[PDB]
Amino acid sequence: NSTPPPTQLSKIKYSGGPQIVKKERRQSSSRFNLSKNRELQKLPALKDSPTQEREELFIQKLRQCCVLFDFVSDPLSDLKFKEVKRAGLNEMVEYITHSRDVVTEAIYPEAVTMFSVNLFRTLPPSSNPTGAEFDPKEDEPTLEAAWPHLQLVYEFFLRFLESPDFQPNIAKKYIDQKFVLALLDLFDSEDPRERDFLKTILHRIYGKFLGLRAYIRRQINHIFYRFIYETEHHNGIAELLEILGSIINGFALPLKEEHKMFLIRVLLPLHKVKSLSVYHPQLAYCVVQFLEKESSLTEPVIVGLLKFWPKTHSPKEVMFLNELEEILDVIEPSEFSKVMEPLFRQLAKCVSSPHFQVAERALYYWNNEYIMSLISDNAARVLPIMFPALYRNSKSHWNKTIHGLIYNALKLFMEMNQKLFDDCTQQYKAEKQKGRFRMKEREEMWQKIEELKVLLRRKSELPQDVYTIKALEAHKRAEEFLTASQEA
Amino acid sequence: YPIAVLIDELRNEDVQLRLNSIKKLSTIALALGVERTRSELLPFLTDTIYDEDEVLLALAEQLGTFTTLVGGPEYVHCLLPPLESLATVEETVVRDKAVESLRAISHEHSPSDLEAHFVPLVKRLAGGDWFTSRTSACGLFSVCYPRVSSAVKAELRQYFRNLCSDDTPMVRRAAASKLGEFAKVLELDNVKSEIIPMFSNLASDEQDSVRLLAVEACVNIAQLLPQEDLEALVMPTLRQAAEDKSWRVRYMVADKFTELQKAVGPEITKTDLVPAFQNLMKDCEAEVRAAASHKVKEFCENLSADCRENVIMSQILPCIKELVSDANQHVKSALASVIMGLSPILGKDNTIEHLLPLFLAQLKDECPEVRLNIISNLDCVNEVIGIRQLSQSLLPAIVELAEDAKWRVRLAIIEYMPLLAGQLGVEFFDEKLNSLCMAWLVDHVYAIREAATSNLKKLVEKFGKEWAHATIIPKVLAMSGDPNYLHRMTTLFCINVLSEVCGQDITTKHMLPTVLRMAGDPVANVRFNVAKSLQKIGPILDNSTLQSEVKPILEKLTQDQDVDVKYFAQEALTVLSLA
């Protein structure tokens, strides 16, 4: 019923100055292991050939397009040898979608070999700078220079997988664990159009190859474990999480211990990376889809979010509050009472925050009548947590919008139940110095020493790269949403 | 002293109050006796605590120093239970602190309880279920190997081989990172038979992030092997790592190339490392060419002296003639930093014929960092070729760079100017280079103006006071009538550095009537720079002029309308002791 949110190709808000333009961001170094001889004449067409020299002509068209050309160093070298590959790749795409019974088992090694020599390569050094002073959302993408040929290889392989005469028992000896690992290494590509085809191809490979499903899930974890704990830099975290969001919707309902350890030890520590804003709509979908699957996991998810609650990063604190409202929308009333005292001690700090975007995001929880439903059934101990946070800061805020929302939140508590208690005067003043009971014993331990809303969002004033942008809007997607894949 | 009080302070629901009460864990252990901190405090840290990772980071940093507070070096194995729990924590800054503290504790161990308490701790971390424990086990093999028995250290080699063949690449990345450090504590016949097959397997790994770490292990492995079996054990692994399909592994061979030259030896360097160096300079990736250009001086310094100038002139120099005209700017800037250093190696006549056109082609390059790096080593070519040859081939390129567009390139000529003027003589400097040093004083960039005043101090130490009085003193005194106030202060800045070197007679009779004349300047910034200069040149003048010509001017500037002129004149009256 639900699909993961589709990953956008260009994720930078370019509403600054549009008169300044860049210089196309051309790639510098080309490739390793190229060919020497690149001579290619035009083979005869597949449709006009007789019906018995069909597969050998299709092999020779696939024996072509395995010679790699140069688009980076000399961008206009061999234009007649580049167009015969481009017309040949476009011929095989149009041949494979319309005609029937065209793939024999002698076509399966050549279509994998044509994929493995064109795309499987070592991605070039990253043109974007790295460091603590760089916003990871404002990284300009660098398009692949061989995209006149690389696009039609991705387009051919996707129509090859989705053909009705595709036999996954024959192709599983050529699409093996070495093919999958080399395909997962390409998800760090800086071209967003390349990552979009890899997301759709890996979704089809996971869907049809049941013997690779435990291997794909393990190698994705190795990508996230390096990303969380070692490098903190990967360009395709949002594309992999969109694949995993379709896997979670197909899990078997007595949920396995392998999948529960994936939520706690992989999905929850992904919230602490500095570049969470790049992949947050895809990460928040995978967390919520676990709790729709099994609501018993609501307690370790919420106490894991409060453990990774950001304190020196205010745009991430708004994203935590946005994700936490989606969890509280689907929470059970029995799970709410188990977790609400660590939950509302954090919301007391967020309502009383000096940041106006953090304060107004937590004060919008009172507009949610389902969250206010669970508060009214637990008002005996959720009100003494929230009442000092709203009453100590009713008039002391620089923004006057927060003055209205705090008064709006305070009148919903008094109409909920008449707890008009006024014991804020002693339980603050006695605990002014109850922390000074423990301070003089802290000094007593030294007595025995011995032996010594346009303005409300962060925009980018970078110059646009108008050739790269219109190339990203001209790229039609491979598939708009990823359907679920049922667990076997 | 009460255990039931501080157990709730360290379990207090505030996170910051748990952090300050656990950063003072040394003072709690100092207050407790050294026997009760073993029986109550340390089991409490073992059993109860698991919290925020900021608390666990502060806890792991304290327990590396508890070797005296626990009872001395013969009870230090009681710190091993808590430190083992912090070595398995998922966060990488706390389990790196825990493995750092585990190495400091291991030196306090006896050789008997290393095999009883520390080696079973390594074998439990190396056989853990999660990768965070197996990663922390890799850093503990070197500090516990050379002090245990032969049967125990045969088990430690088996447990390190299992980490090098791990299922996850996170542990294989950490096993290769500690392969060279672990190999330096093994005996020679065990490196030859157990380290080599596990080093050769980590260099043929499917992940290139594991393969590049085997290159850095190849430096440490080759430097403790004899030269006779470097060809049959190490060299085919290094030859296929320089031809690797990943540029990140070819980058690590080029970045560690001079270390591989010293470790392997001078004879295999001629056979295998010289043709491998030509292929790294002619590489398809610009990051590898820039890394192989940084090493082009140090590689040719350490060649064998029987064939040094023959290898450079026939194999290296045709490859660096093409890195000069390279398209990428990082490789041109990296070559220019070290290309002048191979001028003493080739000799005088080879520098004139072959290296001097390469220097002129980089003094005129379009990149400013190529021009900066080629100026900074201009003295190194000056000791090989003569000053007669430097003034013929390179001096028209230096004079042309004195009016460069980028001011950093203009600054590099000024810092070279007192060295160049001392060798050229005073009769050549006055005719062709004196107008260059005076044109820098009226430059638009202030850092060129203040580098030219310091240049004038270094020039008169090499040429004398009577050269200054006849040539450069009337040039900087005519700058006082410039209608720009930024240049009128340059006269005061020149007098601040010339007064200490031209003596009392030139300061009193030529430079002191100029600083007293512009004390009635309209701009207030010149008016306290006069008072800041009379404090500076004050001690050089005698007491007679200091009381009759300097003091009546400093008393008038304390009646000024501006507050900063009034302050700096009042400050100069106390330093000159004229109050």
Added chain:
Amino acid sequence: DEKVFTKELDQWIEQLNECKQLSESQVKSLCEKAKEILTKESNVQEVRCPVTVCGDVHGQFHDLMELFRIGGKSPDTNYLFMGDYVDRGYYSVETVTLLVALKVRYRERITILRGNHESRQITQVYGFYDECLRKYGNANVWKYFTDLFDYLPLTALVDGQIFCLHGGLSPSIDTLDHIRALDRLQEVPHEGPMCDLLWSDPDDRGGWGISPRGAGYTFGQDISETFNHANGLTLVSRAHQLVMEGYNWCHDRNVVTIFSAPNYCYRCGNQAAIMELDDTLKYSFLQFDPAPRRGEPHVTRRTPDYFL
């Protein structure tokens, strides 16, 4: 004024020049010292003739130290800054602390104006509130600086002929006497005369337009020609906008945009510029590149966001 404070104040400028922040109690005493100086300054400040005029710095401290190597050190060269000192950079705290400390020490040599980023709201959307959290541990230094920002003057008038301000003109202001009647001791509003003085822009459309920035207006050549004649001005210097050459003339040389942050946000690859007015009020522009970065760019595991 008193002598033992200035030797403490001179130590802070020397400490800040090494890119070292001040303590939280030192920022509080500094921002109250600058509050007494700025509260007796007019909404349009009178600056004398020899002065160097600077644009947006935006927290780039190492390019601010490069700016002092083109124009000169702070007591020797009279300076005039046009707001936007705390945002879009890694060292926003050390940039605004130095520029305020020069104002307390050298109140006739520095003149700091208010930009659009010296308000409470804009400085929390971008990374200055998080920078005071990361560098000081709490939100007190942010509260000290943004309360100081209310007392900063809006505009400046160099020699009665050159009008310096951050953003641009407004339909509610047509006379310099109308800027003097404003009340500036408040947070920057979302609309009004004070808001458009820090948010407007020039363009080539003519008349008042809709400022796409969301706040402010856009004014054409016919307005700046009218504003200059009604007040006796020869030039309305400004900034607020990224220009690639560092400076940019507009509107038949009636306004000039000066931007003093080279390689803006360490991405843009632009030059910077400063405008030097000499003793007879003739302008000249010095362009400069970013400072070279020196240190150890090694792999340092950043401290996480949840450690406080």
